[PDB]
Symmetry: C4
Subunit: 362 residues, 4 copies
């Protein structure tokens, strides 16, 4: 009769009921037959928890740090493009909620709000820029320079998207932005993903990527980026230990173990399953983060037990927006925070420093 939403799945169900089909499908979809999409969630269930009893959990402290900046909890907002499709306030709502929670927001290069607009809305929020390497390196450099100028604290360079994955619903729906919206970090019709522009007869976004994003990028482009900015840089989308070691060798400052929300290559493993290999490979030299399939407090606990410093959430944030903008994002983050606090307490962990590998077994 009146929404009573008490877990992240409830927010998704609500979002499906209120969003236009093409928009819900864009946000929900994975690549191809969505094998990895299912596995990102199923894999968490296979990792079992071995809680310690009688540890004194009256005072739980969820605080930690990400690349040297304190956060209230090891749960941060990951980059999700074009948030104004979910709610009129989009990324401005999201950053305000992050400011309230004391956690960080990773801003998409494909945001429907500019780097500057987001900084103005959340001046005291911890903010990072997710970067795509455009064919036009002057565009790419401008994004980085604006992030520096506007008080962003890291670059998350996405390394798994030389081309866009094939999301079948987006092809069926001929996905494009609603008429009033643009990718607001760009000036030209092409780069702003104008829905009045020719992006072919399939997914508009796949065509956008083919036109705008450089499929040639290599470790040499990582060298270029490392020279361009002194900001911390995290490689986002690494799934192999050898690639993780290469990122460390290139002077990067973190790895975000990610399969892009299962939206790129289908049939890759779940992120929680590859996380241990990556943690082992980097030998403590950089922080390792995870995204993909985080929906519950126990997911966060499992990721930290396997050596992630923090996790990022994608889709849950857009479901929060779809419910009630800033307040909805606040709600989703508070649910995750409280579920994580309870999971910590019930497993005997007073703080994030005592979350150890003995807590989990596959």
């Amino acid at each position: 009769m009146l929404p009573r939403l008490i877990c992240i799945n409830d927010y998704e169900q609500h979002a499906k009921s209120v969003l236009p089909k093409s928009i819900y499908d864009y946000y929900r979809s994975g690549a191809n037959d969505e094998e990895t999409l299912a596995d990102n969630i199923a894999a968490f269930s296979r990792w079992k928890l071995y809680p310690r009893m009688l540890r004194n959990v009256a005072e739980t402290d969820l605080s930690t740090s990400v690349l040297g900046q304190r956060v209230s909890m090891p749960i941060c907002v990951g980059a999700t493009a074009m948030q104004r499709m979910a709610h009129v306030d989009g990324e401005l709502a999201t950053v305000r909620a992050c400011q309230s929670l004391g956690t960080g927001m990773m801003l998409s290069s494909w945001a429907t709000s500019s780097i500057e607009e987001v900084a103005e809305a959340g001046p005291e929020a911890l903010r990072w820029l997710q970067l795509y390497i455009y064919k036009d390196r002057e565009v790419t450099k401008k994004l980085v320079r604006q992030a520096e100028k506007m008080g962003y604290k890291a670059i998350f360079v996405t390394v798994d998207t030389p081309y866009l994955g094939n999301r079948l619903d987006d092809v069926r729906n001929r996905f494009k932005l609603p008429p009033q919206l643009r990718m607001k970090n760009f000036e030209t019709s092409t780069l702003s993903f104008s829905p009045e522009e020719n992006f072919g007869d399939d997914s508009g976004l796949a065509a956008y990527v083919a036109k705008a994003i450089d499929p040639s990028i290599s470790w040499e482009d990582i060298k270029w980026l490392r020279r361009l900015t002194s900001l911390p840089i995290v490689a986002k989308g690494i799934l192999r230990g050898d690639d993780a070691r290469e990122a460390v060798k290139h002077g990067l400052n973190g790895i975000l173990v990610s399969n892009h929300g299962a939206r790129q290559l289908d049939g890759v493993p779940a992120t929680i399953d590859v996380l241990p290999e990556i943690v082992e490979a980097v030998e403590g030299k950089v922080e390792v983060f995870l995204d993909g399939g985080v929906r519950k407090g126990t997911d966060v606990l499992k990721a930290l037990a396997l050596g992630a410093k923090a996790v990022f959430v994608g889709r849950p944030i857009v479901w929060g927006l779809a419910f009630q903008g800033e307040k909805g994002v606040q709600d989703v983050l508070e649910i995750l925070k409280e579920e994580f606090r309870l999971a910590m307490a019930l497993s005997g962990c007073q703080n994030v420093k005592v979350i150890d590998k003995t807590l989990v077994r596959k």
Copy 2:
């Protein structure tokens, strides 16, 4: 047309048909997505039986002992709170059925009948008290002293509930006691869980626990309890071998391998799967019991084969109450007894002493 209930699942189906939704949901629920709830049952199915033929099973003897007290069968009633929601006679019905069967009843601290009332109803019944450590240690001590005075033979201290688990239906339903009922071991409105008292806008019971139950408890509180009473004490809710060894070191007299009916931390293993680790860890120094998912005679057989002295049943007892009070509990216990007798006979076991590890393989 007329109930013909011949197995425990039939009693649950009947209970669902007659109980108010909020009450059925409270009794049925597990925590969060109920992964462990499903696994407590599924795990029993993965343990396969290797029966011996031609052993002479004309005389089966199901009798055993629990902490030195003889019982008619290795199947005992576990603590389930607030039984008068299922049937007007609640815990008084349950204890009378246990008296008839010759098995033991573990009484919840959160019973809708007092320690004294239950003793008066079942004077010759084997009875134990399940204890929660209240913030108020005077309350806690009074519970123990009353159990001693009223002829209870052990304390089962619950160690997995510093806070209540998150049972989604109880949040949705805003679970609370029916207006005529109270937790009858307590005098004050707060501690008696009065449904006229302010227990917030979510699960009333979760708020009750946050107000009443001490999240700080540690092994030091176990030391306090061990000094307080000379009764046998069993640690209820242990899932790790290291914790089991610590319980032995603290002078406790048993371990009840339990995930709290899958109602606390979701994603812990099934109790039948962790039982072998715990049996190995305690090296025969104390009795080890199991609860969680026992529905059939073969479940009992599997638990004993893996080294449990006895098992406890939770939900089946409340379904018995929902059917027909004392008679219904009697029925459920008799079904379990007869199923266990048949399973013993068909596997070549004349008595519980010959139920060996070679009977099972995972």
Copy 3:
């Protein structure tokens, strides 16, 4: 519109459509939650075939022998009680079909036709008696002596039924014989399972067994039987290697690896899964047979690859009867024969002697 039944599953579907519910349920059921019933079939699917190509399979020879008697195929009829419930001609139809096919029939002690009647109907058929050890050993001896006199060639002594398993539908349905039928090997109202006799308020057959069948039997009773008859004796219902070795030590002549069609102890392994252990344990000293879940030619092939001499089929035969008596049983046996011939041919096997362990992998 008109039955077109081309595989064993089709015969079952037809049987369900024409038989009274209580009769279909009696024949179909397994014990308790029917975990083993499902597994008897599922386990065959997990054993994969590794066919050899280009072996010359123009001439396939399915013939073999069972306990020294030639059969046309390694597929024989297992004991299924009370066949006249499925078709007026019951066991007489079955034995005539076996005579036509050139395979053997194992006659139930609980047949609705006498040992003599079956011999008269199928004088040239290979016939064996399945024996239950009655409390009354004079009854038991009479069965054996009649089998000897009437040209039966072996005794299959059932060793897994000290009591009947708990088949839930039979309890719900209060299973008993139709009014015109009896267990025709017995004279008295009790032993003939008269439906006019008091067999309690649950399954009539469970009560019959409790009254008639001896739960005390042991290896000493096997010694008695071995002394009583010089006929070959097969132990039916062995699931453990140690028991198989004991059967060999007692001078028995075969083992039928059987979980009684999953009708006795639920949660035992599938017969195809325990067959290798039993074959290994007996070291070629006696023939090993399998029943349980055989529905297709590839099931037969898998069993022989893992070292069974022959398989027995239970339920498929009664579905044949339900369709069209003798002709229906003939049809089912011919389908199994042809499926087995094709499976042999496609796997490169010209005869049963070349069916080797390399053909299968789990």
Copy 4:
């Protein structure tokens, strides 16, 4: 409203909607309970991809070679009988599409178009003949000689069909050719599979095979074929390493790891699962190919990672025909090509030579 078919599964769904039931069922079916049919697809999903990032995939080159002949992609058309049932133009449509794509077509001996007709329609297409060994070796020789004369570049001799598998729908439907069609490589009523000819009361095709195809063939017949033609010969239908080694010893030039689209012996492994054993067994001495269950670009990638030179597709081609003849086949091949290109790019592979075993893990 109007077909929008964007993946191979969409083409199948369309085909089911437009084809007569008997024709769709013939094309779709596997043998018996279709366990292998399901597994051919499911097995691909169990092999997980481990993509390399930042490799420079701006220029992807899909080209390779098959038995010394260049192809545009490692995706070729496998033999599927009687294609004119799907579309009036049948095999002529298929060969024209292959010519356009720059890939090869394997022509069925049971084609509804002659060897010569197909050569005339696709003179510049890479074409191979799939050969069945007929009882009549003069027929068999004529097929080979015509393939030689008409510019076919290899013989794929099918070695897994001494008899036809039992496809239940074909039995139910009494499958036969539509009245206007014939197997056009043959002159006589029997060998042309005339639907006016007596092929029994079950599957017409099973009876055709029993009459026409030689179940006696052995390695001696492979010796005969190797002497008959200097064309490259591939053994099609090998599932064992020992058989693969024998094919190499007989001077054959390739192995097509195939379970005949799961249409012959049911319960054999998926082809992707046996491929590694076969690749290892032949020690690089001949090319190894795969068919069975290829539906997506990632399937192609997985097969090449495990050492296949190329894959063949069966059913997808007939669904293309059912949609729109030549254009439909073109569409299906272009979808597979583009999916494969994207999978290569997202996994860091610029060309087929760098697709390595480290890309996959089961």
